[PDB]
């Protein structure tokens, strides 16, 4: 969200942040990353301008 690399902020991102610094909540956010990652891949399929490689 802070530093764009190649066409960012235009794609909708969801970042999971917990509360406790234990191993379980540090695992839950990784699965929550995985469920909120297809949103980016679907938006990548939605926006594809044909041109140079």
């Amino acid at each position: 969200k802070t530093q764009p690399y190649d066409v960012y902020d235009q794609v909708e991102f969801d970042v999971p942040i917990g509360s406790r610094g234990d191993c379980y909540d540090r695992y839950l956010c990784r699965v929550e990353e995985m469920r909120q990652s297809i949103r980016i891949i679907s938006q990548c399929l939605n926006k594809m301008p044909p041109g140079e490689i």
């Binding site: 469920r35 297809i38 679907s42 939605n46 926006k47 594809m48 044909p50």
Partner: protein, 69 residues
């Protein structure tokens, strides 16, 4: 004519959908079947032990009846 990779989304695969939901068990209803099986369990078992008593006294009666033994 230029031919490149075409874009297709259609249904968008549904971005983050919950699949985990409460099924079969509710909470209080499971205890009615759980403890209900226990109360049915003891009542069925103890009636057989009362039927065992019919055999029990009759088994020991054979020893009393047999004196030439």
């Amino acid at each position: 004519x230029x031919x490149x990779x075409x874009x297709x989304x259609x249904x968008x695969x549904x971005x983050x959908x919950x699949x985990x939901x409460x099924x079969x068990x509710x909470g209080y209803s499971m205890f009615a079947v759980g403890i209900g099986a226990l109360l049915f369990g003891y009542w069925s078992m103890m009636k057989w032990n009362r039927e065992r008593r019919r055999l029990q006294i009759e088994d020991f009666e054979a020893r009393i009846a047999l004196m030439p033994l």
